[PDB]
């Protein structure tokens, strides 16, 4: 709810280059945005639309700069016999970064067999650590053709573990059974040899070829990491969307020996259960939870008709090994809710991690929608706390706002994690920054709350006639986490006998008026600021309503303009918290 | 009850319940009518906007083979206005009957993958054989032809020069280069023309076993003028394949990430021109278009695919599955069986603005027995009538009316439904500054003064 939508950062690339098909962060003491543009033309000799990954600077000016992973054209196997085909290889179709490492891949990279003259899409990746850049093509082996790893398209999906191991997905291996390949980043760079096109890594973990019944399953279509057997080692989660006769499945493998741990299964044919997966602890128990997207899921309405709205399953990992699974349905028809699922970290810093789910083809004019969901003790809050809208109309591809996104990185040192959203159909990427969250404890006391009309204590200035009076005291205290100012300026309103066109039975002593405005400067972290005030009852003869309770209403708001930071990022009040409170007083009978 | 509401406005009285009534007299005024007349209310002043139906066009169901097509009536009634009080439901009695003799359109959509070579030799004279049998069951039978293989892109297809020119160059065997979907023959009465088209077909090939049928199905359903679907006739789309199907985002492997638009993309050559541009359609997209174009989908698939396509068919209204032999020897019997199957099945479908609306169905099939939560009838002799009780309810008072269509699946005849909400009173049609409320200190409406007058 605290994402800044007024002035988000808009990055753009060459038109038709699908700038924003894949996004991530880069944190080496400077900060950067990583954007994939798999259809981007490069200066590589003879290579048309090889694709590139751009490093965009967030600081000051908005400049994306291409990262040179590979400047060379097609290597030759022999004289007049090209070894590879880098044209239209979709390099930058998937980008993943960890500290000083940047991993980008080309899923549609094809290469020549070293036996005969073929053109097999084994896929290839480039890994860049600081200065050294190496190639990584684990499917480019002696196991050729569709029966082997020839059509693997390695790097279709990728991820890092917490112990610097790479997880790579290849949906085409073994007649499209798919495959997960995992290598330690140290062996990838160390065993790298530019004269060897099929490099053997000693510590490699890989799924093996299975029976023919498992063909056309697309394992490795999407990937995610997290611990699921409590041994500290990130385990491998992967969507297998065509498995179980297009019911779709999700496989979990142990991250030490590639042994099978757990399975999830779709509940509808061709819903593409497993299109996207994510793993993050959503209920603050330090047990990673599984999020599985099924964008083509059809739900029945009150009218009984099917409608394609998409579905995400939320599976909470119990200590008992099981999963407590719930399901979250999309909101718009054909919007394909659940196409992308991004863990946000603790977006609002309330102690529970949050997550974003996109419907890239929703909203007016198919401009894309992103939904923000907050975690809590009982799991994920099913109702979104913020709706992110695409602003850019379509010309041929739809905009696909939300088709890729990345969160969980505090790029502005504001104490809150921010969010990148890609929209490749309009060649754009957008950075949404999280606003600081102010928790306010407001108070309102009315004493005495039972009013004797016959008492008349407080004298009123100018008349000898005394009136029945009581005290109205309102308190204000605030604090927040991260970077927010110290001094918070509040504007507070009080209205007596609020639910009264009808006559006001209670007025403030000094103003003789039912309404009172007051500016209140409070300090974050600091003690509670109060102001007491005297109100009085009208004379008994002035009104016929004695039964109805006189409600004292207190409303407060903040100066967002003045609380802003040097970057213009204005704080926001915490949600669930009332920007007003009410207390009622009664007249004696 | 209807009391304790608030008795503020007659309009708000109707909101708390469909059984509630208001007495707009100065003679908790909101209460049930049985109570109101006895409490001391008047006959002409009790305002009850009760839910009701108004039959507009209710022609009796025609039966017994009619030569004049415009006299054919297969659903009754045909036009209705449904005035619904919010909360007060209403049950519609819909009757459906199939006519003996009725035009049938058949579009033969065949997989032309390398596994389908032996099938082709047997279908060389399917046309004359199919139209000969169908001539008995209907007087207007029309057949058309289309073929498919796969999106001609990597990785679904090998992309070396030799493999592109001949994708069976590895066997070595002669096949045509892979193509997405070709619409060869527009629906015609000439069955002999269909035969000749088959003998000229040539087999393709590709790599992966599932194929790009859904691309073809979508195009066949949507392209009405090109394919030649008659307006008031059964639209039969026979899908012949021995393989699974690609759907949706399978094309991401090929770098195709723009969703299917469900539009017609048949060029000057009647070929699908977006085969390499758009994604495979989704089941939800196919359902949407098949229903809109009233196309009944028949899955003639081999044993290994039967169970898979059965599950698909359960999501697609009007869809059925026939067990095709390895050499397609039984395609005649499958088509006839399927036709006769739809010829006895009656499914209701509810189209239009039905979102946020409560709908329930009970089916009165065969002997008279009632099926709860069902809008489908089976085992019916052609001529037998199927009656359905469609219960419609508006949950909350709406602003504008709803256009709804109830129709049998596959048949052209339909039941138009104009559902208009009634949430307002007659009394609110209000005297501003009336002399009834102390020299015009307030307005008078619904028996109550809105400034208990300002005296």
């Amino acid at each position: 709810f605290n994402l800044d939508v007024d002035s988000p950062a808009e990055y753009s690339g060459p038109e038709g280059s699908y700038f924003g098909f894949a996004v991530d962060f880069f944190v080496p003491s400077r900060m950067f945005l990583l954007v994939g543009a798999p259809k981007a033309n490069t200066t590589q000799p003879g290579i048309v639309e090889g694709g590139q990954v751009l490093k965009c600077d967030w600081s000051s000016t908005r400049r994306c700069q291409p990262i040179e992973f590979d400047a060379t054209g097609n290597r030759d196997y022999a004289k007049d016999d090209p070894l590879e085909f880098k044209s239209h290889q979709w390099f930058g179709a998937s980008v993943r970064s960890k500290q000083d490492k940047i991993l980008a891949c080309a899923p549609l990279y094809h290469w020549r067999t070293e036996m005969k003259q073929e053109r097999e899409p084994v896929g290839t990746c480039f890994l860049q650590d600081g200065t050294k850049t190496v190639e990584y093509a684990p499917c480019r082996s002696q196991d050729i053709d569709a029966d082997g790893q020839g059509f693997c398209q390695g790097g279709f999906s990728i991820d890092f573990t917490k112990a610097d191991r790479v997880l790579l997905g290849g949906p085409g291996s073994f007649y499209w059974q798919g495959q997960l390949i995992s290598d330690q980043v140290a062996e990838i760079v160390s065993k790298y040899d530019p004269n060897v096109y099929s490099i053997k890594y000693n510590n490699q973990l890989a799924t093996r070829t299975a029976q023919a019944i498992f063909d056309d399953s697309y394992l490795g279509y999407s990937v995610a990491v997290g611990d699921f057997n409590g041994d500290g080692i990130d385990d491998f989660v992967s969507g297998v969307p065509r498995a179980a006769r297009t019911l779709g499945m999700v496989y979990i493998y142990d991250g030490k020996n590639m042994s099978s741990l757990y399975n999830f299964t779709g509940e509808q044919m061709a819903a593409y259960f497993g299109f996207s997966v994510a793993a993050t602890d959503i209920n603050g128990d330090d047990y990673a939870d599984v999020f599985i997207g099924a964008p083509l899921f059809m739900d029945r309405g009150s009218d009984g008709k099917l409608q394609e709205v998409g579905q995400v399953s939320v599976s909470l990992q119990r200590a008992s090994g099981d999963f407590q699974t719930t399901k979250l349905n999309g909101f718009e028809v054909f919007a394909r809710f659940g196409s992308a699922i991004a863990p946000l970290g603790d977006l609002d810093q309330d102690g529970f991690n949050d997550i974003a789910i996109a419907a890239p083809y929703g909203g007016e004019d198919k401009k894309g929608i992103v939904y923000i969901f907050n975690g809590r003790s009982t799991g994920l809050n099913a109702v979104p706390s913020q709706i992110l809208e695409g602003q850019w109309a379509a010309r041929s591809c739809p905009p696909s706002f939300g088709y890729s996104m990345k969160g969980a990185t505090d790029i502005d040192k504001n104490g809150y994690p921010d969010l990148i959203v890609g929209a490749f159909g309009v060649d754009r990427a957008i950075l949404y920054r999280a606003r600081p969250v102010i928790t306010v404890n407001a108070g309102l006391e009315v004493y005495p709350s039972i009013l004797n009309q016959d008492n008349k204590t407080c004298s009123l200035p100018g008349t000898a006639l005394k009136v029945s009076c009581f005290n109205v005291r309102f308190c204000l205290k605030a604090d927040g986490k991260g970077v927010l100012p110290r001094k918070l300026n509040f504007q507070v309103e009080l209205l007596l006998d609020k639910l009264k066109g009808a006559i006001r039975r209670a007025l403030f002593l000094y103003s003789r008026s039912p309404s009172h405005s007051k500016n209140m400067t409070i300090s974050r972290g600091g003690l509670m600021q109060c102001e007491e005030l005297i109100a009085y009852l009208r004379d008994e003869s002035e009104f016929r309503d004695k039964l109805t309770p006189i409600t004292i209403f207190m409303e407060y708001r903040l100066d967002y303009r003045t609380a802003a930071d040097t970057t213009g990022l204005q704080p926001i009040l915490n949600q669930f918290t009332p920007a007003n409170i009410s207390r009622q007083a009664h007249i004696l009978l | 009850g209807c009391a304790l509401g608030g008795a503020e406005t007659c309009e708000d009285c109707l909101l708390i319940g469909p059984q509630c009534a208001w007495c707009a007299t100065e003679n908790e005024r909101c209460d049930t009518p049985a109570n109101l007349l006895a409490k001391g209310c008047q006959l002409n002043f009790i305002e009850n906007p009760v839910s009701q139906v108004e039959i507009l066009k209710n022609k009796p169901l025609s039966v017994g083979r009619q030569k004049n097509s415009s006299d054919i009536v297969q659903i009754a009634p045909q036009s209705l206005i449904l005035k619904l009080r919010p909360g007060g439901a209403q049950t519609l009695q819909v009757h459906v009957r199939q006519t003996e003799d009725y035009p049938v359109d058949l579009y033969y959509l065949m997989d032309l993958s390398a596994s389908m070579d032996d099938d082709l030799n047997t279908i060389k004279e399917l046309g004359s054989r199919l139209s000969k049998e169908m001539s008995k069951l209907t007087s207007n039978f029309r057949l058309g032809f289309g073929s498919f293989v796969e999106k001609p892109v990597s990785p679904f297809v090998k992309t070396t020069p030799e493999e592109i020119a001949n994708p069976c160059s590895s066997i070595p065997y002669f096949c045509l280069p892979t193509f997405g979907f070709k619409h060869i023959l527009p629906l015609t009465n000439d069955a002999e023309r269909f035969n000749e088209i088959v003998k000229n077909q040539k087999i393709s090939a590709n790599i992966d076993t599932p194929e790009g049928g859904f691309d073809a199905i979508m195009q066949a359903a949507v392209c009405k003028e090109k394919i030649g679907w008659r307006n008031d006739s059964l639209h039969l789309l026979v899908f012949v394949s021995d393989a699974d199907s690609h759907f949706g985002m399978d094309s991401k492997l090929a770098g195709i990430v723009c969703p299917n638009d469900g539009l017609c993309h048949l060029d000057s050559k009647n070929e699908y021109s977006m085969s390499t541009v758009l994604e495979y359609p989704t089941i939800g997209q196919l359902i949407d278009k098949l229903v809109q174009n009233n196309v009944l989908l028949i899955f003639a698939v081999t044993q290994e695919q039967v169970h898979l396509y059965e599950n698909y068919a359960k999501l697609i209204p009007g869809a059925t599955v026939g067990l095709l032999q390895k050499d397609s020897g039984n395609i005649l019997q499958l088509i006839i069986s399927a036709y006769e199957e739809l010829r006895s099945e009656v499914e209701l479908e509810v189209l239009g603005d039905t979102e946020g609306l409560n709908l329930s169905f009970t089916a009165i099939c065969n002997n008279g027995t009632l099926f709860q939560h069902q809008k489908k009838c089976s085992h019916m002799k052609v001529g037998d009538t199927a009656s359905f009780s469609v219960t419609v309810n508006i949950p909350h008072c709406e602003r504008r009316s709803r256009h709804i269509i109830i129709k049998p699946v596959g048949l052209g005849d339909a039941l138009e439904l104009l559902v208009s909400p009634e949430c307002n009173c007659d009394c609110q049609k209000v005297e501003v500054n009336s002399s009834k409320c102390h020299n015009g200190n307030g307005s008078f409406q619904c028996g109550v003064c809105a400034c208990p007058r300002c005296e």
């Binding site: 007649y175 063909d215 | 993958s113 390398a114 596994s115 090939a205 790599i207 076993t209």
Partner: peptide, 11 residues
Amino acid sequence: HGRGDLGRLKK
């Protein structure tokens, strides 16, 4: 009946 679209012809 075989592995791939060329299964029958390969056999």
